[PDB]
Amino acid sequence: MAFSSEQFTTKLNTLEDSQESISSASKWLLLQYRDAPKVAEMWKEYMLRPSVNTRRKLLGLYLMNHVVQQAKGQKIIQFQDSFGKVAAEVLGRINQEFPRDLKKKLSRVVNILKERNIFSKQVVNDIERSLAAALEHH
C-alpha cells in the first residue's frame, strides 16, 4: 500500500540537508494530499521523539518548508493546514533543542514561510509566539 508504519520516519532517515532528497520527499508528501492530516501527525511525532537528534529535526524542518510551499501553490490546502496546525508547537519545540546556529537557520525558514504567507497569519502568530517563548529568555 502507499502507507505503512513510520514510512515518513524512514524517509527522513534517508534525506539530506538540501533540496535534492528534500524536494523529492516533499513531492511524495504532496502526492499524499488525501492523507495530509495523517502524515502531519506522524511528522510532529517523528521530530517530537528524542530518539532522533537535531540533525534529523533539521531535515524534516526543510522537508516541511518545501511541502507547505507547494501545497500553498497549487491547492493542497490540507497539507499547509495539517502542518500549520502542528507547526506552532512543533517548531516551538525545535527551538528548545537546537543550538543558537540551527535556531537562526530555522528562524530564517520560518520567516521565509511567513513572507510567502504559507500559513494563515493567525497560525503564523501561533508559530511566532511559540518560537518567541522558545527563545529561552523573555
Binding site: E16, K75, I112
Partner: peptide, 16 residues
C-alpha cells in the same frame, strides 16, 4: 545528494 540550497528559492506557486 547535497547540492546548494536557499529556502527562499524553491517553489511557492509552481502550478495549479
Amino acid at each position: 545528494t547535497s547540492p546548494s540550497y536557499s529556502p527562499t528559492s524553491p517553489s511557492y506557486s509552481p502550478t495549479s
